[PDB]
Amino acid sequence: MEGCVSNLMVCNLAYSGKLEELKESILADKSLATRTDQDSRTALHWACSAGHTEIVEFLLQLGVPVNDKDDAGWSPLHIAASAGRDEIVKALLGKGAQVNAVNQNGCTPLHYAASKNRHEIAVMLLEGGANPDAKDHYEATAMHRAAAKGNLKMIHILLYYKASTNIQDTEGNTPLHLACDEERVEEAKLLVSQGASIYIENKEEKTPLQVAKGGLGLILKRMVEG
């Protein structure tokens, strides 16, 4: 069934996208925005989730801390990146929000930006001085998910910032291995032509040539020697 996503009134009002009642609530009491629910979130998070620009601009005008995190450590920037809204990202980054903030699994907003396949959000986030070589608790970059979801333009704009392809996962699987697992010819040939090392072995001791099927590793090696 459906219903209220939270016990707090201001959070449900922020999720419903009611501007006048929320503004009235703030004008009535200024401590309502500082309250916390069982999910340890504020109205700002649900507002960024709703995708309303006016509300979050008003809140950020009030000076509400963007560094506030929940029990799972989710930042408003992660929710904004997951929502696929450009204006919210413009507001948050415009207020000086930290791009180095990490959640429970330590995944940077760039990961969720490449997950929802949002080019503008990723570009704007990486423009703020973010590090594309940053690793999570699982020691994996956004290039992994980008190659896993089969996004050429994402990897391309990630390579516009000259991000290193030499990052090794704790499992031992390089983004090239994920590119071969996704059976993407263009992505594989591109990454290989960009100087990606195929000599990196995983815990399974499996070369990227053995990962791909149909003689794809053959033409990959052809691109290496060529």
Partner: protein, 52 residues
């Protein structure tokens, strides 16, 4: 749910892999049948993972 992340759950089980995933999900349903929370979140999933 939007709070639920598929990244950590596509990551950690790749390291440590158990059996009967759907059964574990049903156990999480038994955790969510306690009427403490309307929408199931990553907490119930992680708990169901660490318990069994």
């Amino acid at each position: 749910s939007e709070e639920v992340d598929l990244e950590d759950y596509v990551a950690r089980p790749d390291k440590i892999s158990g059996a009967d995933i759907n059964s574990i999900c049903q156990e999480s349903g038994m955790l969510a049948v306690r009427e403490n929370r309307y929408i199931v979140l990553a907490k119930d999933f992680e708990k169901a993972y660490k318990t069994v």
